[PDB]
Design an enzyme around this catalytic site. Structure first.
Site, PDB file in Angstrom:
ATOM      1  N   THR A  78       6.829   5.287   2.055  1.00 62.28           N
ATOM      2  CA  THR A  78       6.802   5.583   0.689  1.00 62.28           C
ATOM      3  C   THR A  78       6.281   4.352   0.355  1.00 62.28           C
ATOM      4  O   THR A  78       6.545   3.577   0.271  1.00 62.28           O
ATOM      5  CB  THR A  78       8.117   6.139   0.506  1.00 62.28           C
ATOM      6  OG1 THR A  78       9.037   4.748  -0.067  1.00 62.28           O
ATOM      7  CG2 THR A  78       8.995   6.466   1.627  1.00 62.28           C
ATOM      8  N   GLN A  79       5.469   4.866  -1.000  1.00 59.37           N
ATOM      9  CA  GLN A  79       5.066   4.271  -2.091  1.00 59.37           C
ATOM     10  C   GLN A  79       5.844   3.856  -3.181  1.00 59.37           C
ATOM     11  O   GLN A  79       5.795   3.682  -3.813  1.00 59.37           O
ATOM     12  CB  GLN A  79       3.805   4.851  -2.712  1.00 59.37           C
ATOM     13  CG  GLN A  79       2.343   4.779  -1.470  1.00 59.37           C
ATOM     14  CD  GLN A  79       2.312   3.346  -0.857  1.00 59.37           C
ATOM     15  OE1 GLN A  79       2.128   2.106  -1.338  1.00 59.37           O
ATOM     16  NE2 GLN A  79       1.499   3.728   0.349  1.00 59.37           N
TER      17      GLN A  79
END
Ligand code: SA1
Ligand code: SA1
Lengths: 200, 240, 130, 202, 237, 197, 212, 122, 216, 236
Positions: free
Chosen positions: I1-2
């Site tokens: 995830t960013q």
């Protein structure tokens, strides 16, 4: 970095400094900027140390394989072409290489300039690095094809010394090599402090 | 004529002889038995010891496929191990996608389809193993399925695979297993195993027992040693 | 797989490629085609094996195909294989015209097709073009 | 958007608004944000209309196939797991907040929340959307244990009306669904059926 | 015969003749013995080559600090399996920082060897293996057959004329658990001597030893290193 | 910046290039050749980005000579030019574009002399005269003023000298010496270099 | 998202005629916080080689594991242990394999060569390496290096005898230089781990540095 | 793809397909080569059809400016081998900047033929 | 995830004579909103190992899935070998470093606690692959507020009892409730000893607000 | 028929058919002899010259793998070129990575790994269809001293003191048995190998129909010239 090479009647003269820098910090003062590809063939390193070392060692491996397969030593032009083809595949990816390939083959003495941008040029006089501009002036004012061996040695030492005097990223010692028909010899390693004493 | 060299060939009368030869491979193996009661499932294997140099626990024919699912095999042990790995992977994938423990009927169907995929082509060989899957849950109850080298899966109340399957089935039919408890079933399983064994041809054997039920909290495990030794005593007494 | 393999691309004990010889036999039984070269032109003459009264005339010719603006061909043997090969010839000529912007020379087209046909006698395990 | 689900003994109640917006323009004013995933399983969709529709269709396909193969009614947890897998795998690509409510014979009435990012949590009541922010205190003050179906319907309608008054992205009609063992009952509240709360005047 | 050329063909008797033919390769090879006490595990190998100039072929290989193997049959297959086992142990150390348990390694080998026996145009691995190992459960001796079946043994001999060694081991196996290292190695050497033709004897040239234990990495004693063990070994009957 | 020029006459083509290879502010080489021999009557003149020039030029050279070996006759100038444009255009939209500007000069037995201009976007034009570089801006009007289609090769060399003299007077870069070649029915001839002390 | 972070740490290596010394600090930090006070940065490779890694800690851990695996593989293939120079060349190729997503690690190798003499090899993060007589690396490398140039290399000294370096003098110098470094560098402190490589093996010593 | 093994060993240690290819060579036209002091001489047998063959584009072929080849056997195979050799000659001119040696191109051709005696489907 | 979406605050860990204790609050925050107030951020891995995580709850749930399956797979074999806390710590480090090297991190900071072979284990893993061991650990804002107090106790008295360790954890949780904005008043306490893993559920801290009257 | 069996088929005796047939191909080749001494390794081979028109200098039965390693080959000489290229590439890659020379055993092992890598299906395009019909003798000098290794098509490699391969191997091996002792000098080894080669060759041994090479500690791989060969031949 200051590297220098010229062809004269008695062969090829290669000279380099020995300073390795990381920013404005002097990492080393004894680095080796000349790679011995084979007993008849030398290469110089400027720019990225790791890049030049890795790719010229790879060239040395390929040249040995050539000698094994073809039972004849490789030529200077072929070696420089091999290096240029190898580094063209990585264009735009951030390689920093400036190299001089020097040797003696069936056509006589040879000197080629190969850079990571893609240039491969033959010539009689070359200088690469930050201090190359300072070396060019001394070399151009002193260079003749009919030099004597000791005169050629002195000219190369003087040019590297002046480059180290004016350039902040050059210094240490002058390492000198003479490519002859029977192979290259290590001439001298002279500290620029002793050269300052001699020339002043 | 060569109507029996490939699994992609029918014979003139409609038979795939390669699958039948794999079934012959299963019939030469030693006998495994599975009995189901209202609260659980019990597995018993006659494990022949081919030398005294072998340790206790060598060549196990009972596997844990999932924490609630157990497997009893007969035939070629390497094929059985590969099938056990296939079943384990199926159960793991089911838990990772749908989020609960796989039902036994679904697992049996999936593994039977994987086995059937090897009965269609000349490029692969049929499996030389037959096996029983057993499970317990509160929702589904106690389940016992059997799968053969062709890929047929059926649910059973009592099942036997291997060399003495018919005699074992005759013995299993004498039990009113629906109204029995897992403790009684272990002793009856041991007794049947000792009955069907032929001492003259087969030299020596271990009894491998396992069970799954409410007694074990829906976890498949080896029967504890004391229960096993008590059951073996009962079986040896019954043989006089 | 090994049992059913016909082994088309191998040698006989006498150095012969048998499937190629059998295809040559197929060609020996097809309709006649003759080509004659002159000073002012060149001609092809074929015999028509479709001579039923209930046959219809349509198209341009039965055995003569136009490959380019400057080239044409006539075929003998299996007709469907001919349709495949003529489609490929037209493709080769148009690819050359795209690359060089000149019409292809005749021998280059012949050489390209013959490279294709040699490929089928050396690898792949398929039958040759008859 | 405002979506809500409340669990009562023996089933669930779901409710939603009916506004689709493209900026400040209402493209659809009577939309249905409650989707039948199975016979007794529904989802409330929040976020991207296209993304939520695609995910709902895929889960409906997978759940129908699963139910045919197992010959059983599906579980609400299974549907929530399928939604969670898809929303976590494509969390970089999808904007989808889901509520999954339903009834199954084993666990009764269940409510699961799958927020953006792909986590899955079981709740006694769940609220979502942009308008859900304005009713957090109201649901915390008004929720009590052991509500009946009629009390749950009234509670959900009140909360949705309060959310629609304050949010520019919520409005229209109120869509309600009650799911129990006997089945699904659907209602629309429009006009004067929508609860009214007096506005302060000087 | 139409049933004996492919590994995918069942015979009407329910056998695969290619796997039996592959087991013949193990039966032809030179003999090796393996045994375990309560603390150590020993592999004794009969080295030999074609001629006296040709040094005796290498039979005992090093897999990991806790695992070694002995070979019978096709040496190239043995090197393939050895490389596979080395990589599996290395991956276990990379991921979990612990040694791979020996039983799990033998399971992985069995999985690798079974695949070729089910596919057209493949062959079994014509190699029989004896694995000596030490882990948290003690010392282990394992046997691997070309049929992809593996066994957990108290002792085992494989190779040519290894039935006589197995007979000797069965007679004396109750002692092994209580032995010290030199006694265990001498037991293995006596069993290995049982396979030689009556004129041949055990020398420092034709014998290789491999030892693993509670506080000893797997060691291969060949040449002068084996003289301490060959000492004090009574003549054959 | 590098300079190329080409003049077409009734039976000849005249090409000239500069001989400078530069890095940053220094001239590393002053006898560089920028003309590649495709065949016995075709010349390719290439300037542009370092590495791209030699790689593209030598690829084209190798394929043209392979055509000669395979077919027993040589490509015509028009066909060679169209092959070059096809390859440059195909590589234009890929991940490895070539930034090269080219002139192609040739003689055909049936079509006569030909000069072709190609930019880095792979557009191909046929011209009576053409030039490449920053110096083109200074010398194209001199060619426009004094060029006639019936010009002899002596007068062509004189006009070339005029253009190079203008470069010596008005251009900010040091381009002191130029390579000069001519292509006629007898092939490629090296003329004297035009040098300015 | 940044894939790197700076975790501090100083390493030092001094080569002798018959010895090598590799020293490091034991503090692991991130930003202005201290993670742990007991994380040494020196790792034993063979009975004759020690490596020192500073920089980003995840890269340090991964590289240590990779090097150990490669040593085991070499011993399997070639039946002997790897020499210090072979390890240096192998590490150079390992570092260049990640040229376009580098290891943020500074490496110093210390050990004995095949004649029994001391050898120090210094690396940059992409694989350029050199054989030295002494080298400092990490956050306080710019403080430590000039003093070693003066005291080990005798640079800028006039009429001073170039007496060969003794193990006692080298140990005292290492202790003093780390004491000076812990005064001025915030990333350096806690404890000092010194590893001495001789033909008798590897010997360890720990001394205390200031905890602020 | 077709992965059958064509060239295999026979019980006596023979590769039968290679021997049959040698039979194919034995059926072909006769070529004779003599090495001279200053010249090299290459002679071939022609199968000529009276008045009807067109020998205008036919050449004994050239791989480069300095190497010539003569073949015996299957003519289409020879065309394939000649084109491969020509491509290799141009590559050598590019990569080495010098013309090929006769032995270099002979080695390339021999290795190509050997590769076709040990590959699947060929 | 960013970009993390639903997160948890700080996790605490202390080792004592005979085991380890780990503490975490039961809140999942969507930005500044206390959205999910009854979630458990501590996991029982096996009878010797427990795990607590801070950061993205979805990434934590993925890790719980993978780790649980790995434990089940090992228990199916029945060979008497189990995963130690140290092996699970090493596997977690490898997983996080592999994700970081693909530029797709798992946005978690993890504390591993265990008791095996009469020895206590406490380990830290971060999103980038930084992993280490220490006698006390704290993630997030606890690294600034709780680690000082724990460290001060441990320097003077290096060995603690279960009672002392639990009291110290409760003090540190109180401090976190005073000074962390993303904190909640309900927490869970997991303990690993020779008896195994025990989790004690919703616990609250007693707060003092006398200084409110000193404002004047 | 030839295609009833696949290439990976076992015999009832437990041997791969193709490997046995390739080993039979080994028996049809020229005779190579290798002797190991404390002063170095000697490799002698016979050139089988069929016509007076053949130039014997184009027959290369002994090659240089590296400055410290040489190889002698027997059998189907065209098959050996792939293995030799692999060996050369392996030695140069080892020098590139580790900055040192390879050991003879490692080179032999790397070449032996290719020997059984043949099949029809489940193999990548560009895979081998049959075994190699060559026997190889590797001779070199490393830190363990002078080493001589033998490799056959089965993949098996052994270390040997003296060894003969080819058509006349059995008789040559018996003679080597008679004449080999551990204290031989390299000159004695060269003379003994030439005596045996003269015994087994169907032609008469002169300086153009044989090859001899040595590897010594300190001196590189040396191929004997015709003059040195005549010097040695004079004694025989
Ligand atoms: C020289 O160009 C230089 C050297 O460090 C470098 C190192 C040794 C071998 C190759 C040459 N490279 C650099 O980046 C610095 C800055 C300019 O000069 C350097 C000293
Ligand atoms: C609600 O979140 C909302 C709806 O358009 C959308 C409609 C169909 C079902 C899913 C939810 N999504 C949006 O982007 C707009 C802006 C805020 O709320 C919307 C109305």
């Amino acid at each position: 970095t200051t590297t220098l090479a010229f062809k004269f009647r008695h062969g090829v003269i290669v000279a380099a400094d020995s300073r390795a820098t990381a920013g404005a910090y002097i990492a080393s003062q004894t680095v080796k900027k000349v790679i011995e590809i084979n007993p008849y063939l030398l290469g110089t390193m400027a720019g990225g140390a790791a890049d030049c070392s890795f790719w010229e060692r790879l060239l040395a491996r390929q040249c040995r394989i050539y000698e094994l397969r073809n039972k004849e030593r490789i030529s200077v032009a072929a070696a420089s072409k091999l290096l240029a083809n190898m580094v063209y595949q990585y264009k735009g990816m951030g390689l920093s290489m400036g190299t001089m390939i020097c040797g003696w083959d069936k056509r006589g003495p040879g000197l080629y300039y190969v850079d990571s941008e893609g240039n491969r040029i033959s010539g009689a006089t070359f200088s690469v690095g930050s201090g190359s501009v300072y070396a060019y002036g001394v070399m151009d004012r002193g260079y003749s094809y009919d030099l004597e061996v000791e005169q050629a040695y002195d000219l190369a030492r003087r040019a590297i010394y002046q480059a180290t005097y004016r350039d902040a990223y050059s210094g240490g010692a002058v390492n000198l090599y003479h490519v002859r028909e029977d192979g290259w010899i290590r001439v001298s390693s002279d500290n620029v402090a002793d050269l300052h004493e001699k020339y002043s | 004529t060569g109507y029996d060299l490939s699994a992609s060939t029918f014979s003139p009368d409609g038979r795939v002889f390669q699958v039948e030869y794999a079934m012959k491979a299963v019939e030469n193996s030693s006998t495994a038995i599975g009995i189901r009661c209202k609260d659980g499932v019990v597995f018993g294997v006659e494990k022949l010891v081919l030398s005294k140099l072998y340790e206790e626990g060598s060549n196990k024919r009972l596997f844990n496929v999932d924490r609630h699912v157990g497997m009893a095999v007969a035939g070629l042990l390497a094929d059985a191990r590969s099938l056990a790995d296939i079943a384990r992977e199926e159960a793991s994938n089911f838990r990772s996608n749908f989020g609960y423990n796989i039902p036994l009927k679904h697992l049996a169907d999936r593994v039977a389809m994987y086995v059937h995929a090897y009965t269609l082509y000349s490029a692969v060989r049929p499996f030389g193993c037959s096996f029983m899957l057993g499970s317990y849950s509160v929702n589904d109850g106690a389940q016992l399925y059997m799968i053969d080298p062709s890929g047929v899966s059926y649910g059973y109340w009592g099942c036997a695979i291997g060399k003495a399957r018919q005699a074992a089935k005759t013995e299993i039919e004498k039990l009113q297993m629906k109204e029995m408890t897992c403790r009684d079933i272990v002793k009856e399983v041991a007794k049947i195993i000792y009955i069907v064994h032929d001492e003259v041809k087969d030299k020596a054997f271990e009894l491998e027992l396992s069970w799954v039920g409410e007694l074990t909290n829906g976890r498949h495990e080896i029967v504890p040693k004391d229960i096993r030794e008590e059951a073996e005593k009962y079986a040896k007494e019954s043989l006089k | 797989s090994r049992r059913y393999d016909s082994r088309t691309t191998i040698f006989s004990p006498e150095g012969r490629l048998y499937q190629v010889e059998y295809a040559m036999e197929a060609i020996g039984h097809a309709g006649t085609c003759l080509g004659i070269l002159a000073n002012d032109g060149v001609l092809l003459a074929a015999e028509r094996r479709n001579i039923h009264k209930l046959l219809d005339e349509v198209f341009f010719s039965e055995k003569i195909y136009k490959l380019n603006e400057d080239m044409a061909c006539s075929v003998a043997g299996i007709t469907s294989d001919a349709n495949v090969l003529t489609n490929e010839l037209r493709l080769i000529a148009q690819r050359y015209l795209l690359q060089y912007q000149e019409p292809i020379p005749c021998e280059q087209l012949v050489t390209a097709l013959c490279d294709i046909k040699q490929a089928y006698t050396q690898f792949g395990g398929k039958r040759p073009f008859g | 958007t405002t979506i809500m689900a409340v669990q009562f003994d023996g089933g669930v109640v779901l409710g939603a608004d009916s506004r689709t917006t493209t900026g400040s323009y209402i493209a659809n004013r009577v939309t249905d944000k409650l989707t039948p995933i199975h016979d007794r399983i529904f989802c409330c969709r929040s976020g991207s209309a296209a993304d939520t529709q695609a995910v709902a269709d895929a889960v409906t396909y997978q759940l129908g196939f699963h139910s045919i193969e197992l010959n059983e009614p599906p579980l609400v947890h299974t549907a929530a797991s399928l939604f969670k897998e898809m929303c976590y795998r494509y969390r970089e690509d999808l904007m989808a907040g889901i509520i999954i409510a339903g009834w199954d014979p084993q666990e009764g009435g269940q409510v699961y929340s799958v927020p953006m990012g792909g986590m899955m949590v079981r709740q006694s009541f769940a609220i979502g959307g942009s308008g859900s922010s304005y009713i957090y205190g109201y649901v915390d003050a008004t929720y009590r244990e052991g509500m009946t179906k009629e009390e749950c319907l009234q509670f959900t309608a009140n909360a949705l009306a309060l959310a629609m008054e304050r949010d520019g992205s919520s409005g229209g009609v109120i869509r309600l669904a009650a799911i129990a063992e006997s089945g699904v009952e659907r209602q629309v509240l429009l006009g004067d059926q929508i609860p009214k709360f007096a506005v302060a005047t000087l | 015969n139409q049933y004996d050329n492919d590994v995918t063909v069942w015979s009407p008797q329910g056998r695969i003749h290619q796997i039996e033919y592959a087991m013949e390769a193990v039966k032809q090879g030179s003999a090796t013995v393996g045994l375990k006490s309560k603390t150590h595990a020993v592999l004794v190998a009969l080295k030999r080559a074609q001629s006296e100039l040709a040094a005796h072929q290498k039979k005992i290989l090093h897999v990991d600090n806790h695992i070694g193997i002995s070979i019978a049959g096709l040496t190239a297959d043995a090197r393939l399996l050895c490389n596979f086992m080395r990589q599996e142990c290395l991956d276990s150390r990379f991921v979990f920082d612990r040694p791979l348990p020996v039983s799990r390694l033998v399971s992985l080998i069995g999985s690798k060897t079974q695949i070729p026996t089910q596919r057209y145009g493949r062959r079994p691995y014509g190699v029989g293996l004896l694995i000596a190992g030490y882990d948290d459960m003690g010392p282990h001796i394992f046997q691997t057959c070309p049929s992809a079946n593996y066994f957990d043994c108290r002792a085992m001999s494989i190779g040519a004329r290894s039935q006589s060694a197995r007979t000797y081991l069965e007679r004396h196996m109750s002692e092994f658990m209580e032995c010290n290292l030199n006694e265990l190695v001498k037991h293995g050497l006596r069993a290995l001597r049982e396979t030689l033709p009556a004129e041949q004897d055990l020398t420092t040239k034709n014998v290789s030893i491999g030892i693993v234990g509670k506080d000893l990495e797997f060691t291969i004693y060949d040449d002068d290193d084996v003289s301490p063990f060959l000492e004090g070994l009574e003549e054959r009957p | 910046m590098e300079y190329l020029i080409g003049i077409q006459g009734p039976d000849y083509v005249l090409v000239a290039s500069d001989r400078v290879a530069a890095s940053n502010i220094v001239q590393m080489k002053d006898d560089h050749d920028k003309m590649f021999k495709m065949s016995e009557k075709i010349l390719l003149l290439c300037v542009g980005e370092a590495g791209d020039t030699v790689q593209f030029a030598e690829y084209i050279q190798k394929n043209v000579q392979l055509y000669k070996m395979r077919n027993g006759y040589e490509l015509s100038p028009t066909a060679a030019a169209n092959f070059t444009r096809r390859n440059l255009a195909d590589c234009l939209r890929s991940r490895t574009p070539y930034h090269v500007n080219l002139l192609l000069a040739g003689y055909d037995e049936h079509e006569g002399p030909a000069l072709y201009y190609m930019d880095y976007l792979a557009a191909l034009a046929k011209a009576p005269f053409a030039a490449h570089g920053y110096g083109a801006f200074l010398t194209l009007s001199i060619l426009d003023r004094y060029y006639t289609p019936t010009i002899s090769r002596e007068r062509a060399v004189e006009l070339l000298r005029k253009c190079l003299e203008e470069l010596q007077k008005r251009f900010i870069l040091n381009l002191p010496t130029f390579s000069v070649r001519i292509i006629d029915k007898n092939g490629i001839h090296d003329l004297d270099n035009i040098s300015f002390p | 998202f940044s894939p790197y972070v700076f975790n501090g740490g100083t390493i030092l290596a001094i080569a002798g005629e018959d010895f090598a010394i590799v020293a490091s600090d034991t503090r692991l930090s991130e930003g202005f916080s201290i993670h742990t006070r007991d994380s040494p940065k020196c790792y034993k490779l063979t009975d004759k080689t020690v490596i020192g890694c500073s920089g980003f800690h995840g890269d340090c851990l991964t590289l240590t594991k990779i090097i150990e695996a490669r040593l085991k593989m070499y011993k399997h293939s070639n039946n002997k242990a790897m020499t210090t120079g072979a390890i240096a060349a192998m590490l150079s190729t390992i570092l260049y394999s990640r040229r376009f997503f580098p290891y943020y690690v500074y490496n110093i190798i210390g050990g004995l060569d095949e004649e029994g003499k001391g050898a120090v090899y210094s690396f940059d993060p992409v694989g350029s390496y050199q054989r030295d007589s002494f080298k400092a690396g990490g956050s306080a490398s710019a403080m430590l290096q000039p003093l070693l140039d003066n005291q080990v290399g005798f640079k800028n000294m006039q009429n001073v005898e170039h007496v060969p370096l003794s193990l006692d003098r080298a140990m005292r110098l290492v202790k003093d230089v780390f004491i000076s470094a812990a005064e001025r560098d915030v990333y350096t402190g806690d404890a000092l781990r010194i590893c001495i490589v001789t033909k008798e093996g590897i010997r360890e010593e720990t001394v205390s540095l200031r905890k602020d | 793809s077709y992965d059958r093994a064509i060239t295999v060993f026979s019980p006596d240690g023979h590769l039968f397909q290679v021997e049959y290819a040698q039979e194919a060579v034995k059926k072909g036209s006769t070529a004779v080569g003599v090495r001279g002091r200053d010249i090299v001489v290459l002679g071939v047998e022609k199968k000529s059809v009276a008045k009807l063959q067109d020998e205008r584009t036919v050449r004994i072929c050239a791989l480069d400016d300095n190497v010539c080849m003569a073949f015996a056997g299957l003519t289409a195979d020879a065309r394939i081998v000649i084109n491969r050799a020509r491509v290799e000659c141009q590559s050598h001119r590019l990569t080495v900047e010098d013309p090929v040696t006769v032995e270099y191109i002979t080695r390339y051709i021999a290795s190509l033929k050997q590769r076709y005696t040990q590959s699947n489907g060929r | 995830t960013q970009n993390p979406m639903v997160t948890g605050t700080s996790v605490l860990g202390v080792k004592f004579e005979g085991g380890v204790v780990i503490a975490a609050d039961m809140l999942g925050s969507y930005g500044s909103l206390a959205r999910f107030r009854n979630i458990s951020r501590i996991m029982r891995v096996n009878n010797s190992t427990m795990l607590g995580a801070s950061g993205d709850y979805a990434d934590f749930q993925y890790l719980k899935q993978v780790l649980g399956q790995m434990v089940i797979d090992e228990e199916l074999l029945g060979d008497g070998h189990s995963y130690s806390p140290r092996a699970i710590h090493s596997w977690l480090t490898r997983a996080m470093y592999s994700r970081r090297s693909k530029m797709n991190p798992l946005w978690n900071t993890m504390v591993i606690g265990g008791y095996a072979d009469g020895e206590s284990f406490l380990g830290y893993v971060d999103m980038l692959g930084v992993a280490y061991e220490a006698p006390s650990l704290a993630t997030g804002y606890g690294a600034y507020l709780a680690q000082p107090l724990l460290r001060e106790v441990l320097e003077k008295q290096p060995v603690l009892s279960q009672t002392e360790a639990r009291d110290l954890v409760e003090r540190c949780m109180r401090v976190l409730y005073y000074r962390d904005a993303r904190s909640y008043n309900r927490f869970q306490i997991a303990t690993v000893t020779e008896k195994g893993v025990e989790i004690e559920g919703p616990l609250s801290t007693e707060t003092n607000w006398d200084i409110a009257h000193m404002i004047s | 028929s030839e295609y009833d069996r696949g290439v990976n088929t076992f015999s009832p005796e437990g041997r791969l058919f193709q490997v046995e047939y390739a080993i039979e191909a080994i028996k049809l080749g020229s005779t190579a002899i290798g002797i190991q001494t404390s002063e170095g390794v000697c490799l002698a081979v016979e050139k089988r010259i069929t016509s007076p028109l053949m130039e014997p200098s184009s027959i290369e039965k002994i090659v240089e793998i590296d400055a410290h390693i040489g190889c002698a080959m027997s059998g189907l000489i065209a098959d050996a070129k792939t293995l030799i290229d692999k060996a050369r590439v392996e030695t140069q890659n080892h020098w590139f990575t580790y900055n040192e020379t390879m050991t003879v055993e490692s080179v032999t092992q790397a070449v032996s790994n290719l020997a059984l890598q043949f099949g029809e299906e489940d193999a990548d395009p560009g895979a081998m269809s049959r075994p190699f019909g060559v026997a190889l003798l590797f001779g070199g000098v490393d830190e363990k001293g002078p080493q001589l290794f033998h490799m056959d098509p089965s993949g098996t490699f052994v270390q040997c003191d003296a060894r003969a391969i080819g058509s006349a191997s059995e008789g040559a091996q018996s003679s080597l048995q008679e004449v080999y002792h551990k204290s031989m000098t390299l000159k004695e080894a060269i003379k003994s190998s030439l005596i045996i080669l003269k015994q087994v060759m169907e032609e008469k041994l002169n300086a153009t129909n044989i090859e001899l090479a040595t590897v010594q500690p300190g001196q590189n791989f040396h191929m004997f010239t015709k003059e040195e060969l005549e010097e040695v031949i004079k004694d025989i």
